[PDB]
């Protein structure tokens, strides 16, 4: 009953609240020679255009 009452706008708001321009936590196991470092990953959670 609560699952058919969700609005697309509400879902977009929830997605924007917690993803956009937020600090993530990364865990890596393996060849870290090729996996990007945190700083770069922190700079791609937002876009210049927005």
Partner 1 sequence: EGHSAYVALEQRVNTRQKGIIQRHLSPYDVDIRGNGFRQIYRLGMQKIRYFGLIGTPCLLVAGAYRGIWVFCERLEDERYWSNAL
Piece of the chain touching partner 1 by CB under 8 A; list 1-9, 12-20, 37-45: 37-45
Query: Which are the contacts of 42, defined by CB distance < 8 A and separation ≥ 6?
Result: 23, 24
- To the nearest whole angstrom, how small is the minimum distance from the Cβ of residue 44 to partner 1? 14
Measured from the CB atom, is 6 or 35 closer to partner 1?
A: 35
Applying CB under 8 A, among 18, 23, 43, 47 the residue interacting with partner 1 is 23
Q: How far apart are CA 4 and CA 7, in angstroms?
A: 8
- To the nearest whole angstrom, how small is the minimum distance from the Cβ of residue 23 to partner 1? 5
Tokens of 22: 């937020």
Q: How far apart are CA 23 and CA 20, in angstroms?
A: 9
């Amino acid at each position: 009953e609560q699952l058919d009452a969700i609005s697309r706008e509400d879902l977009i708001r929830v997605a924007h609240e917690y993803f956009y321009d937020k600090d993530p936590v990364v865990a890596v196991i393996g060849d870290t020679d090729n996996v990007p470092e945190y700083d770069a990953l922190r700079a791609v959670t937002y876009s210049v255009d927005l």
